Amino acid sequence: APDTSVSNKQNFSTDVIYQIFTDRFSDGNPANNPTGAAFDGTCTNLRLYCGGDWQGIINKINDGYLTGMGVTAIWISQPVENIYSIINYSGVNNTAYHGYWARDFKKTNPAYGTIADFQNLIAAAHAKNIKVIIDFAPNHTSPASSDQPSFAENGRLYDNGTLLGGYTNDTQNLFHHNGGTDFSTTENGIYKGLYDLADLNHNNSTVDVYLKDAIKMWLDLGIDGIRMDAVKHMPFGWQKSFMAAVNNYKPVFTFGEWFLGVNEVSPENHKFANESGMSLLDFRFAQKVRQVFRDNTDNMYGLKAMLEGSAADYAQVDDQVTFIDNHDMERFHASNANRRKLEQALAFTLTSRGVPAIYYGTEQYMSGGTDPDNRARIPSFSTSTTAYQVIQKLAPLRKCNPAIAYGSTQERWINNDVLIYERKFGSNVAVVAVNRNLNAPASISGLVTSLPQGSYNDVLGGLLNGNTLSVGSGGAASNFTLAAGGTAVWQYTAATATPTIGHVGPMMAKPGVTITIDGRGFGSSKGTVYFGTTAVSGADITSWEDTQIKVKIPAVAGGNYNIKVANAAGTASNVYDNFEVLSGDQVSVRFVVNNATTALGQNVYLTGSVSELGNWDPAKAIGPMYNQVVYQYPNWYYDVSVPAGKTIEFKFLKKQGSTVTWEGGSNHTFTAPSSGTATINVNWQP
Ligand SMILES: OC[C@H]1O[C@H](O[C@H]2[C@H](O)[C@@H](O)[C@@H](O[C@H]3[C@H](O)[C@@H](O)[C@@H](O)O[C@@H]3CO)O[C@@H]2CO)[C@H](O)[C@@H](O)[C@@H]1O
Ligand SMILES: OC[C@H]1O[C@H](O[C@H]2[C@H](O)[C@@H](O)[C@@H](O[C@H]3[C@H](O)[C@@H](O)[C@H](O)O[C@@H]3CO)O[C@@H]2CO)[C@H](O)[C@@H](O)[C@@H]1O
Ligand SMILES: OC[C@H]1O[C@H](O[C@H]2[C@H](O)[C@@H](O)[C@@H](O)O[C@@H]2CO)[C@H](O)[C@@H](O)[C@@H]1O
Ligand SMILES: [Ca+2]
Ligand SMILES: [Ca+2]
C-alpha cells in the first residue's frame, strides 16, 4: 500500500489529526450515559458527564462531518475504565469524564462504550480512511489520599477486575510516597506525585509488567497510534523500555505530552524526542504560534527562529505533533477577537512540518478559558464556516503534496508581519504567504521560489484574500500586493525520479522487526536497503513500491545507523539517520552508585558494554544521574533501559563539560533480568 494509506500505522505526516473529547462530542447511545449527580444532559456543568460516546463518533464519521473536513485521523480520550466516584473539591463535584483517572487499564469506560463498541469504532474509522489514536496515561491512576482512604477510590488499581492495591497501606509499594511535585526540577516532577494523583512506581515489577501487557491488548484491538500522557513525569529510562515493548510487538506511531510554557526551550525535551523511541507534541511550535497570531507578543522573526531552531534540535522534526490549543489551554479563538487570526493559524499549521492536530470545535470558532471552560460540548456540525473550508482545502494537500508532508522549510520573504515560506521535497514545491497584519497590506517584491515559470492559483481559492502568483525565470516572482490578513498557498507537483526517503518508522527496534520507509521514486522493483554499511535485499524486504518499502531489521550489532536505499538500477537515495537498533528486548533497571562526590557543575554518568549504555563512549553516557528524591547525594540513581537477560559490564564517570573522570578499579558486572525490573546498588571505586 502507498505511504498515504490508512494502513500505515508508522507514519502520520500525511495525516491531519482531530482531537476529540469523547464526552463532549456526540451522544450516540443515551443508554450508557451515567446517572444521578454524575450526569448533566444539558452539559451546562462542564465537570460532569455530558453523554458523548464512541457510537456518537461513529455517527459523525458516517454522516460525513469529519471526512468532508479532510480529517484522516482522530485522537480520543483514554478508553480505559476510570473511577466512578464523584469527587468534591470545595463544593464543586467532579467526574472522570476526561478519562485521565484510570482504575483498570484492561477494561473500557462504560460511559464511552463496551469493547464491542470500540471494535466498531476501529472498523468504521478505517472504512473511511481514518486512523485511530488513543490517549494513554500510565503515570498515575486516580486522586488519592493516604489519610482519607474514603476519598475517591484511594487510587486503587485493578487488573481486569482483580484488585492489585490502593494508595493507603501500600505495603506492596505500587505507588510513590514522596509527596507532591512543585515542578521545580525534572527529577522532582518525575518521582513525586502530580497534584493529588496516585503516582505509579514503574520500578515495581508488578506495575512494569502490568502496563506493558495492558498496552498490548489495545494494540491487538487495532489502534493506529498512541498519545502518551505526562511523559515529562515518568522515568525516561522506563518509557524507552516501554516503547521497545510496543515497537518489538506491534509498532504504532507514538507521541507524548511534554508541556512547555511560553518562551521555554528545554534541552531535555529535545533529548527525549531524539532517543526515547517516541516523538512529542510540539509545545514550542504551539506557544510561538499563539504569540505571533493570537496574543501578538512576538513577530514573524520569532516564528522564523522557532522553525529554523526546531528543525535543528529535533532529529525527526517531521514527527512532532503540532497544534494551536488543546484541553489544557484557553481556546485559541477569543470571543471578541477577529476570526481571521484563528483561520491564519490553521492555514499555517496545516502546511507546516510535523503532524497537524486540530482540537475539536476549532472549526466552529468555540471560545473558552482554561479547564473546564475549554471543554464545552461542540455547538454545531455546520460545514459552512470559513475555518471548516480552510481545513477542507489544505488537509488533502498533505496526502497529495509530499513537499508539505516531508518537505524542508525555508524562509523566502519576511518582515514584522509577513512570512512567506517554501516547503520542498523532490520535484514537489509549496509556497505559503501569510500577513498577520489585519489592517495593513504588504508590497511583496523580490520573492524568489523553486516554482517553475508560470502562473499559480491560490489553493485556498481566495478564501483568505489570497492572490494569483506569476513566476518568471529563475523562480523570480513578479511584484504583487499581499492583502491585509492575507493568506495564500501556491504549489507544484511532479513525479520524482530519484529515490527520496521522506520518513522512517519505528525509529527504534530489535533485529527482526519490520520497519516502514516512505518517500518517492523508489521504483516498482526491489532494490537494496542499507543499515550503515550492511546491505539488505531479497526476501527480508517484504514489500517494495514507489512510495513505500517494508524491510526487516538485519541482525546487526546494537547501535545507531543511517538508513539508505537504492533502486533496482543502483541509484542511491538520501540518508535518513538516527535509527537505533536495540540489542534485544528491553527491561528497565535502576542503577545506584554510592559515595560519588562531585563539585558544582560536575555530574555522574553511566556507561557500559552495550549500545543501550553507549558502548564505553563518554559522549554517549547515560545521565546526568539524579541525587535528590529517591536517593540523595553523594548517592546517585537513574532508571535505564537495557537488553533483557544480558550480562553487562559498566562503570560510572564524573563529567564537567566534555572533561571525563573514570571510576577506578574493574568494571562492575551484572546480568539484567529477562523480565520485570531490578535495582543494582554499587559503590564508586576510587
Ligand atoms: O542535584 C543536582 C546537582 O547535583 C550536583 O550538585 C552536587 C554538587 O556536585 C556537590 O558538590 C554538592 O554541592 C555542594 C557544593 O559543592 C558546595 O560548594 C556547597 O555549595 O555545598 C553544596 C551542598 O549541596 O551537592 C550537590 C547536590 O545538591 C551537580 O554538581 C549539579 O550540577 C546538579 O545540578
Ligand atoms: O574504551 C574501552 C574501555 O573503556 C573502559 O576503560 C576505562 C577504564 O575503566 C578507566 O579506569 C580508565 O583507564 C585508564 C587507567 O586508569 C590509567 O591508569 C591508564 O593509564 O589509562 C587507562 C585508559 O587508557 O580509562 C579507560 C578508558 O580509556 C572500560 O573499563 C574497558 O573495559 C573498555 O575496554
Ligand atoms: O531577493 C532575495 C531575498 O529575498 C528575501 O528578502 C526580502 C526580505 O525578506 C524583505 O523584508 C524585503 O527586504 O525584500 C527582500 C527582497 O528584496 C529573502 O528574505 C532573502 O533571504 C533573499 O536573499
Ligand atoms: Ca452516551
Ligand atoms: Ca510520576
Element (H, E) at 19: strand 17-20
- The burial class, CB within 10 Å (0-12 / 13-18 / 19+), for 47 is middle
CB atoms within 10 A of CB 474: 8
- Nearest ligand (C-alpha, residue 649): 2
Calculate the CA dihedral of residues 176, 181, 185, 188 and round it to 10 degrees: -10
Record the cell numbers describing residue 168, joined without a space: 493507603
Which CATH number does the domain housing residue 423 bear?
A: 2.60.40.1180
- CB contact at 8 A, 233 and 258: no
The residues near 46 (Cβ < 8 Å, ≥ 6 apart) are 372, 373, 375, 376
Record the cell numbers describing residue 472, joined without a space: 518568471
SS3 track for 74-139: EEECCCEEECCCCEEECCEEECCCCCCCEEEEEEECCCCCCHHHHHHHHHHHHHCCCEEEEEECCC
Please state, in angstroms and rounded to a whole number, the distance separating the CA atoms of residues 439 and 70. Answer: 31
Q: Which one, of 138, 361, 371, lies nearest residue 256 by Cα?
A: 138
The residues near 555 (Cβ < 8 Å, ≥ 6 apart) are 511, 512
- CB contact at 8 A, 132 and 121: yes
Please state, in angstroms and rounded to a whole number, the distance separating the CA atoms of residues 133 and 554. Answer: 29
Please state, in angstroms and rounded to a whole number, the distance separating the CA atoms of residues 491 and 451. Answer: 7
Record the cell numbers describing residue 95, joined without a space: 467526574
Please state, in angstroms and rounded to a whole number, the distance separating the CA atoms of residues 637 and 635. Answer: 7
Provide the angle, in degrees to the nearest 10, between the axes of the packed helices 115-127 and 54-62.
20
Provide the angle, in degrees to the nearest 10, between the axes of the packed helices 386-394 and 340-350.
10
The residues near 447 (Cβ < 8 Å, ≥ 6 apart) are 412, 413, 420, 476, 477
Domain count for the chain, please give it.
4
Q: Establish whether 229 is a catalytic residue.
A: yes
Calculate the CA dihedral of residues 655, 660, 663, 665 and round it to 10 degrees: 180
- Residue type for 366, please? M
Q: Of all protein residues, whose CA lies closest to atom 21 belonging to ligand 3? A: 412
Angle formed at CA 480 by CA 479 and CA 482, multiple of 5 degrees: 145
The catalytic position among 224, 229, 363, 417 is 229
- Nearest ligand (C-alpha, residue 238): 5
Which CATH number does the domain housing residue 329 bear?
A: 3.20.20.80
Pair (28, 81) in one structural domain: yes
The β-bridge relationship of strands 647-656 and 659-662 is antiparallel
Alpha-carbon distances, residue 321 vs 19, 168, 656 (angstroms): 12, 38, 34
Which residues have CB atoms below 5 A from the ion given as ligand 4? 27, 29, 32-33, 51, 53
Domain end among 567, 582, 597: 582
Q: How far is CA 317 from the centre of its chain?
A: 11
- CB contact at 8 A, 579 and 529: no
Please state, in angstroms and rounded to a whole number, the distance separating the CA atoms of residues 367 and 483. Answer: 27
Record the cell numbers describing residue 449, joined without a space: 521560489
Residue 292 DSSP code: I
The β-bridge relationship of strands 355-359 and 17-20 is parallel
Please state, in angstroms and rounded to a whole number, the distance separating the CA atoms of residues 589 and 639. Answer: 6
- Residue 418 CA: which ligand 3 atom is closest? 11
- For residue 583, the SS3 value is coil
CB atoms within 10 A of CB 661: 14
First to last CA, the chain: 58
Q: Of all protein residues, whose CA lies closest to atom 6 belonging to ligand 1? A: 600
- Residue 411 CA: which ligand 3 atom is closest? 19
**Contact 600 CB / ligand 1 (< 6 Å):** yes
- Residue 627 CA: which ligand 1 atom is closest? 1
The residues near 367 (Cβ < 8 Å, ≥ 6 apart) are 331, 333, 334, 335
Domain end among 400, 417, 436: 400
**Contact 415 CB / ligand 3 (< 6 Å):** yes
Backbone angles phi, psi at 655, to 5 degrees: -125, 135
Pair (431, 369) in one structural domain: no
**Contact 628 CB / ligand 1 (< 6 Å):** yes
- For residue 467, the SS3 value is coil
Pair (105, 161) in one structural domain: yes
- Nearest ligand (C-alpha, residue 615): 2
How far is the centre of ligand 3, averaged over its atoms, from the C-alpha of 496 (Å)? 29
- CB contact at 8 A, 403 and 425: yes
Backbone angles phi, psi at 322, to 5 degrees: -90, 160
Pair (106, 31) in one structural domain: yes
**Contact 205 CB / ligand 2 (< 6 Å):** no
Which CATH number does the domain housing residue 530 bear?
A: 2.60.40.10
Record the cell numbers describing residue 589, joined without a space: 533497571
Pair (409, 554) in one structural domain: no
Q: Of all protein residues, whose CA lies closest to atom 25 belonging to ligand 2? A: 662
- CB contact at 8 A, 120 and 58: yes
Please state, in angstroms and rounded to a whole number, the distance separating the CA atoms of residues 531 and 609. Answer: 21
Calculate the CA dihedral of residues 433, 425, 276, 243 and round it to 10 degrees: 110
- CB contact at 8 A, 18 and 125: no
Please state, in angstroms and rounded to a whole number, the distance separating the CA atoms of residues 345 and 370. Answer: 20
Backbone angles phi, psi at 59, to 5 degrees: -65, -40
Record the cell numbers describing residue 15, joined without a space: 495525516
Pair (505, 477) in one structural domain: no
Edge to edge, what strands does the sheet with 559-566 contain?
A: 508-509, 576-581, 559-566, 528-531, 534-536
Pair (534, 656) in one structural domain: no
Record the cell numbers describing residue 409, joined without a space: 522549510
Please state, in angstroms and rounded to a whole number, the distance separating the CA atoms of residues 264 and 259. Answer: 10
Q: How far is CA 521 from the centre of its chain?
A: 28
Residue 329 DSSP code: S
- Bridge partners for 533 per DSSP: none
Angle formed at CA 46 by CA 331 and CA 290, multiple of 5 degrees: 10
Provide the angle, in degrees to the nearest 10, between the axes of the packed helices 205-220 and 236-247.
40
Q: Which residue has cell 526491489?
A: 526
Reply yes or no: is the peptide bond before residue 506 cis, omega within 30 of 0: yes
Pair (487, 610) in one structural domain: no
**Contact 657 CB / ligand 1 (< 6 Å):** no
Q: Which residue has cell 533529548?
A: 271
Record the cell numbers describing residue 49, joined without a space: 458527564
Q: Which one, of 549, 465, 542, 541, lies nearest residue 500 by Cα?
A: 549
- CB contact at 8 A, 44 and 70: no
- Nearest ligand (C-alpha, residue 665): 2
User: In sequence order, what E strands does 151-250 have?
Assistant: 157-159, 162-165, 197-199, 225-228
* Percent of the chain as helix, strand, coil, to the nearest 5: 20, 30, 50
Element (H, E) at 219: helix 205-220
Pair (450, 477) in one structural domain: yes
**Contact 410 CB / ligand 3 (< 6 Å):** no
User: Can you give the residue range of the structural domain that contains 552?
Assistant: 496-582
Q: Of all protein residues, whose CA lies closest to atom 14 belonging to ligand 3? A: 446
Domain end among 472, 495, 518: 495
- CB contact at 8 A, 350 and 391: yes
- For residue 299, the SS3 value is coil
How far is the centre of ligand 4, averaged over its atoms, from the C-alpha of 100 (Å)? 18
Reply yes or no: is the peptide bond before residue 624 cis, omega within 30 of 0: yes
Pair (546, 418) in one structural domain: no
Record the cell numbers describing residue 129, joined without a space: 480512511
Note the resolution in Å, 1 decimal.
2.4
Q: Which one, of 328, 216, 231, lies nearest residue 276 by Cα?
A: 231
Please state, in angstroms and rounded to a whole number, the distance separating the CA atoms of residues 208 and 588. Answer: 8
Q: How far is CA 213 from the centre of its chain?
A: 21
Reply yes or no: is the peptide bond before residue 634 cis, omega within 30 of 0: yes
Q: Of all protein residues, whose CA lies closest to atom 20 belonging to ligand 1? A: 600
Alpha-carbon distances, residue 446 vs 125, 388, 455, 456, 477 (angstroms): 46, 33, 17, 17, 7
How far is the centre of ligand 1, averaged over its atoms, from the C-alpha of 255 (Å)? 34
- Bridge partners for 530 per DSSP: 535, 564
- The burial class, CB within 10 Å (0-12 / 13-18 / 19+), for 90 is exposed
Please state, in angstroms and rounded to a whole number, the distance separating the CA atoms of residues 619 and 609. Answer: 14
Q: Establish whether 257 is a catalytic residue.
A: yes
- CB contact at 8 A, 438 and 340: yes
- CB contact at 8 A, 263 and 302: no
Pair (482, 432) in one structural domain: yes
- Bridge partners for 572 per DSSP: 566
Report CA torsion sign: 608, 610, 615, 618: negative
- Residue type for 463, please? L
- CB contact at 8 A, 14 and 425: no
Q: Which one, of 537, 496, 541, lies nearest residue 520 by Cα?
A: 496
CB atoms within 10 A of CB 91: 5
Pair (376, 405) in one structural domain: no
Mutate to test the pocket of ligand 3, among 308, 409, 411, 413 (most ligand atoms within 8 A of CB): 413
- CB contact at 8 A, 250 and 555: no
Record the cell numbers describing residue 643, joined without a space: 537488553
